[PDB]
Amino acid sequence: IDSSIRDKLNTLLSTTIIPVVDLTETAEGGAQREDLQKAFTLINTIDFDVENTTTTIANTPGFYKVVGNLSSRDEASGAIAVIEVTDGITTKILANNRIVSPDGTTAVQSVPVPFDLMVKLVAGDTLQARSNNAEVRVQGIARQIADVSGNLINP
Amino acid sequence: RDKLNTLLPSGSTTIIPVVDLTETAQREDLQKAFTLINTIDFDVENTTTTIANTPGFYKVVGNLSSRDEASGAIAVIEVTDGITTKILANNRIVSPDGTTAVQSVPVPFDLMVKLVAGDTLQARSNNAEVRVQGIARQIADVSGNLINP
Amino acid sequence: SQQFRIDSESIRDKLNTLLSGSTTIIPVVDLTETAEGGAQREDLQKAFTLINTIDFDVENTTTTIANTPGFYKVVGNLSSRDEASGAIAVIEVTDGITTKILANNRIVSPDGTTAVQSVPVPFDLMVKLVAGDTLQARSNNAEVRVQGIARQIADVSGNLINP
Amino acid sequence: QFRIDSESIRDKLNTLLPSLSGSTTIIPVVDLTETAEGGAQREDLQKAFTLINTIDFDVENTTTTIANTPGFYKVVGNLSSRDEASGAIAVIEVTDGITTKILANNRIVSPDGTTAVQSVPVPFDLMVKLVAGDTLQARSNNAEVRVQGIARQIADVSGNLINP
Amino acid sequence: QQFRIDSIRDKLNTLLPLSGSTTIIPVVDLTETAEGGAQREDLQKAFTLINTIDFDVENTTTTIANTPGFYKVVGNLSSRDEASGAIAVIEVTDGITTKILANNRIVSPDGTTAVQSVPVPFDLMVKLVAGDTLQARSNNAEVRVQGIARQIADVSGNLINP
Ligand code: NA
């Protein structure tokens, strides 16, 4: 054997094919399929509907699924609605509503702008929804999918 | 860091080739299919309609009638237990500017919702002008056992 | 490099339907795919071809997409209309007695105007038909369309169908 | 060790390993398969677009071949939506020169009480397999409507994957 | 007991630079635990404050990434008429060949010059090799390219953990 393989083997820890049966799943407590395990429930759902304020979705470590819509405005509009992740020093917008660019009119129709995110927060991070104006709203739901170590949280 | 102790109440430097016989000893997309019999179809106008109120996982997909965020017309998917209600899909999202002629679009939702004892998944419209439309089916029981289409 | 007793009835039952455990972790490389002649991957299995594609563009009639047992993928668009319109464009499943709408076009709720813009209403479904079932596309009016494509993905039994 | 009684398993093993006992000692393994093959081992990485593999297209008032050799293709993008009554056509189609099937159609909107007809993108996202003589194409019959997108070959006609 | 096996031979030589067993071995797999956990696609691909390449491009060309590896990039462009002079798009380039991967000039209004605009979404997995650049570009103050990206894997295909 001459190989990267020794390297992966190193980090992580023949000519007869061996027939095996994998019992990880049952030893793990049974199978939990991704779509079911990520299900929203009444108790686990972080519902939000933010207009003219800043509202925390999550501020403790872990992985979060967050889906929803923002009120679209002209890209030059003064009315903003976003999902952003921040630590108070650096802030990054993960979903932006000022995206549309009408031509030849000041009558500007608006549509929802969908977002569907998986965000991982570590210590000191905050995932928040923000709207700076009563006319625009960040609406959606979120839930914790897993703890910061990656251990899955049952729905 | 031995998870070997939990599942099963040194390391070799020789890689052994294997073949897995587990499967031999249902695909997700097929398992979750809609049929005439399992489909919970709904088209909700000026009323509140229960999609499901018995424990289990449900898949629910469809559209709401968009309205101005300032509108009084409500069309939503929501989960309640009669004490706490949380909205899972909201129609009052649009923000037109420089006009009172407010075009509307469908607002799509595609959700997996688990209900436990006493939970209700429901579609609600408070006005004849806005709709909650879509379909649902039960994907699994409350214990996570899959249901065949 | 010696073993250890284990106490599980969940593992034990599962091994009968399909004790102790060694303390030397073996590196392996799975050869099951090659051994089988290559494995199928979902996204390729479900591919559309010129032969298998059921294309439809439906206007002011009712058109069968499929009416024989099996699992069907069906994707496309409907012409959106005001929720109050009489103009209907839908994907439905029926058995001649009960009919259920799987995609619905009468959804928009314009306000303060009667000039009603329209957009495509996307659908993307997996539908299993059993004996007697029909999947159809229906437009009741020349102004509205049901457009899209579909193909049989697997038989009523579940056996995947090569593209 | 013990003996197994199952014909299905003996048959699976017969075909998988061409030319029966069980064990009661669970062996903890680690899997190095993805590393021994190396890179783009997960579906999403293997299907990546690159500057070299990307078939970019932006079609206006002409027919443009996206692919015409056997293989599985991923093709994603948008059409200019027009009124369902329009004569302006922007589609993705597949053909053998005899039969032609549209896989993404742009003539879908149904405005009411106006002739000022707003237009939006109509997204498509397809997996298409072509055999000998099949052509995958984008077609616009008018300079006012576009078929835009990207495609790439995901696999040869036999299902063997192509690295990005 | 052993038995001789006579594709698999080619695979073994390729994979690890011939016989079978009759005793079926029960086993547990700890690779994900050994890899450090959260290797499930959705978790591993998560955006974080540190890894997120956020961009909001207007009237300028902005690099999203220009070093080898696989990137996920998602976002929106400001739609314009297909004949519009205002472009915002996401494209990969080598400084010789450039290809647009998301294009905003898609709408075709009829019977009006009052042209409404919507977000044009993109969701891409892009692999850059040496000399490749992925960038967002807008030629006009009126149109944006917005969204986020991160590196999912190195060019060799090793996953990067969030
Ligand atoms: Na308000």
Question: Which of B59, B77, B84, B81 lies closest to B137 in space, CA to CA?
Answer: B59
Q: How many CB atoms lie within 10 A of CB D49?
A: 23
User: Which letter does DSSP use for residue D17 in this model?
Assistant: S
Helix (H, G, I), strand (E, B), or coil: what is residue C125?
Answer: strand
Q: Are A126 and E133 in contact (CB under 8 A)?
A: no
3-state SS track over D36-87? HHCCCCCHHHHCCECCCCCEEEEEECEEEEEECCCEEEEEEEEEECEECCCC
With contacts defined as CB-CB under 8 Å, which chain A residues touch C11? 23, 26-27
Give the gap in angstroms from C-alpha E16 to the nearest C-alpha of chain B.
9
Tokens representing D159? 């299902």
Cα–Cα dist D114/D117, whole Å: 7
Radius of gyration from C-alpha coordinates of chain D? 24
* DSSP code of residue C12: H
What are the beta bridge partners of residue D95?
A: D100, D135
Whether E106 and D47 lie within 8 Å, measured CB to CB: no
Spatial distance between the Cα atoms of A71 and A135, rounded to a whole number of angstroms: 8
Shortest Cα distance, chain B CAs vs residue D9, angstroms: 6
Which residues precede a break in chain E, with C-to-N distance above 2.5 Å? 6, 17
Contact criterion met (CB < 8 Å) for D17 and B18: no
CB A64 within 8 A of CB A121: yes
Residue contact C15–A9, C-beta within 8 A: no
C-alpha separations of D140 from B93, D102, D119 in Å:
35, 12, 16
Whose tokens are 């607002």? That residue is B107
Q: Resolution of the coordinates in A? A: 2.4
For residue B113, give every residue at least 6 positions away whose Cβ sits within 8 Å of its Cβ, in sequence order, or none.
A39, A40, A41, B57, B58, B60, B79, B88, B121
* Percent of chain A as helix, strand, coil, to the nearest 5: 10, 50, 40
Residues 78 through 107 of chain D touching chain B, CB cutoff 8 Å: none
Annotate B61-115 with DSSP letters as a single string: EEEEE-EETT-S--EEEEEE-SS-EEEEEE-EEE--BS-S-B---EEEEEEEEEE
Q: Which of D117, D84, D107 is nearest to E111 (CA)?
A: D117
- Nearest chain B residue to A136 by CA distance is B95
Residue D33: DSSP 8-state? H
Q: Is E119 on the interface with A (CB under 8 A)?
A: yes
CA of A112 to the centre of ligand 1 (A): 15
Sort out which chain C residues have CB atoms less than 8 A from D127's CB and list them: 43-44, 46-48
DSSP state of D6: -
| CA separation for the pair C87, C89 (Å, rounded) | 7
Q: Give the neighbours of chain E: at least 3 Cβ pairs within 8 Å.
A: A, B, C, D
Q: For residue D82, which amino acid is it? A: R
Dihedral angle sign, alpha carbons of residues D49, D51, D55, D59: positive
A26, A28, A72, best to mutate vs chain C, most C CBs in 10 Å:
A26
In the structure encoding, which two tokens stand for residue B75, read together?
A: 């069309």
> Quick check: helix, strand or coil at residue E48?
coil
β-pairing verdict for A126-131 and A98-100: unpaired
Strand order across the beta sheet in which C70-79 lies = C54-59, C145-154, C70-79, C120-129
Nearest to D138 by CA among D99, D96, D105: D105
In the numeric block, the tokens 């990434």 are attached to E65
First to last CA, chain C: 49
Nearest to C96 by CA among B36, E130, D56, A145: B36
Q: CA neighbours within 13 Å on the CB side: how many for C98?
A: 9
Q: Which residues pair with C29 in a beta bridge?
A: B17
> Given CB atoms, is D132 within the 8 Å cutoff of chain C?
no
Residue of B36, B39, B47 to mutate, interface with C, max C Cβ within 10 Å: B36
User: Is the separation of the CB atoms in D147 and D139 below 8 Å?
Assistant: yes
- Whether B16 contacts C22, CB under 8 Å: no
| Cα gap A41→B80, rounded to integer Å | 10
| Closest residue, chain D, to B9 (C-alpha) | D26
Smallest Cβ–Cβ distance between A27 and the set C11, C25, C27 belongs to C11
Contact C144 D107 (CB under 8 A): no
Q: Choose the mutation target among A6, A23, A32, A103 for the interface with E, i.e. most E CBs under 10 Å.
A: A103
Which residue is listed with tokens 């009661």?
Answer: D24
Q: Which two tokens stand for residue B79?
A: 């989960």
Best of D14, D82, D118, D141 to disrupt the E interface (most E CBs within 10 Å) is: D118
Q: Which amino acid is at D86?
A: S
Nearest Cα of chain D lies from the Cα of C110 at a distance, in angstroms, of 11
Residue C9, Cβ neighbours under 10 Å: how many? 7
Report yes or no: D84 and C146 within 8 Å, Cβ to Cβ: no
Whether A77 has its CB under 8 Å from any CB of chain B: the answer is yes
Closest CB from A13, A20, A23 relative to C11? A23
Residue found under tokens 């500017």: B97
Mutant choice from B95, B102, B105, B142 vs A, greatest count of A C-beta within 10 A: B95
State the distance from the centre of ligand 1 to the C-alpha of A136, rounded, in angstroms.
Answer: 7
Chain B residue at shortest CA distance from D7: B25
Among the listed residues D158, D152, D134, the one whose alpha carbon sits nearest the alpha carbon of residue D73: D152
Interface contact E47-A2, CB threshold 8 A: no
Map tokens 């660019």 to a residue: A101
Q: What is the 3-state secondary structure (H, E, C) of A28-82?
A: CCCCCCHHHHCCECCCCCEEEEEECEEEEEECCCEEEEEEEEEECEECCCCCCEE
Structure token digits, residue E106: 């898609």
Q: What is the DSSP letter of B54?
A: S
Three-class SS state of D35? helix
Taking CB atoms and an 8 Å cutoff, what residues of chain E touch A121? 48-49
Q: Which two tokens stand for residue E4?
A: 């001789």
C-chain CB neighbours of A21 within 8 Å are: 15, 18
- In this structure, are residues C94 and C161 in contact, taking their beta carbons and an 8 Å threshold? no
In sequence order, what are the residues at sequence separation of 6 or more whose Cβ sits closer than 8 angstroms to the Cβ of residue B99?
A107, A108, A109
**Between the CA of residue E57 and those of B99, C91, E53, E71, E86, what are the distances in Å?**
28, 40, 12, 18, 13
* Cα–ligand 1 centroid distance for B66 (angstroms): 15
Number of neighbours of residue E142 by Cβ within 10 angstroms: 21
For chain E, the 3-state helix, strand and coil shares in percent, each to the nearest 5, are 10, 50, 40
Contact A112 B98 (CB under 8 A): no
Measured distance CA(A129)–CA(A67) in Å, rounded? 11
User: Which pair of tokens denotes residue E91?
Assistant: 């494209």
- The contacts found for D11-17 with CB under 8 angstroms, 24 or more apart, are D12/B21, D12/B24, D13/A19, D13/B19, D13/B21, D13/E20, D15/C36, D16/B19, D16/C32, D16/C35, D16/C36, D17/A17, D17/A19, D17/B19, D17/C35, D17/E3, D17/E5, D17/E8, D17/E20
Q: Using CA atoms, how far apart are residues A118 and A145, in angstroms rounded to an integer? A: 9
Total length of chain D: 164
Q: Does the CB of B117 have a partner CB in chain C at under 8 Å? A: no
For residue D112, list its beta bridge partners: C116
C14, amino acid identity: K
Q: How far apart are CA D78 and CA E77, in angstroms?
A: 13
Copy the structure tokens of residue E99. 């290809």
User: CB distance from E15 to chain D under 8 Å?
Assistant: yes
User: For residue B29, what is the enclosing H or E element?
Assistant: helix B28-31
The beta strands (E) that lie in chain E are given as: 2-4, 19-21, 23-29, 53-58, 61-65, 69-78, 80-81, 88-93, 98-103, 105-107, 119-128, 133-138, 144-153
Report residue A137 as tokens. 């709203």
Taking alpha carbons only, the member of C34, C39, C1, C7 closest to residue C20 is C7
Q: Which domains does chain E have, with CATH numbers?
A: 1-162 (2.60.120.1010)
Q: How far apart are CA D23 and CA D11, in angstroms?
A: 19
For residue B96 the two structure tokens come to: 């037109």
Dist CA B115 CA B94 (whole Å):
30
Nearest to D77 by CA among A16, C93, E77, B43: E77
Q: What is the dihedral of CA C53, C58, C64, C69, to 10 degrees?
A: 40
Interatomic CA distance for residues B125 and D142, integer angstroms: 42
Nearest to B20 by CA among C30, E16, D11, D9: C30
What is the rounded CA–CA span in Å between residue D69 and residue B64? 43
Cβ distance A127 to A82 under 8 Å? no
Distance CA C46, CA C151 (A): 8
Tell me whether B24 touches chain D (CB under 8 Å): yes
| Residue C116 to residue C110: CA distance in whole angstroms | 6
Of A20, A109, A137, the CB nearest to B96: A109
Q: Is E30 on the interface with B (CB under 8 A)?
A: yes
CA atoms lying within 13 Å on the CB side of residue B126: 10
Q: Which residue has the tokens 């995958």?
A: D136
> Do the beta carbons of residue B5 and residue A27 sit within 8 Å?
no
| Ramachandran area for residue D48 (φ above 0: left; ψ -120 to 50: alpha; else beta) | beta
Instruction: Identify the CA nearest to C155 among candidates C50, C66, C63.
Output: C66
Token pair listed for C1 = 């490099």
Quick one: which of C88, E26, D80, B91 has its CA closest to A68?
A: B91
Considering only CA atoms, which of A121, A119, A76, A77 is closest in space to residue A95? A119
Q: What distance lies between CA A118 and its chain's CA centroid?
A: 2
Q: How far is it, in rounded angstroms, from Cα D73 to Cα D92?
A: 13
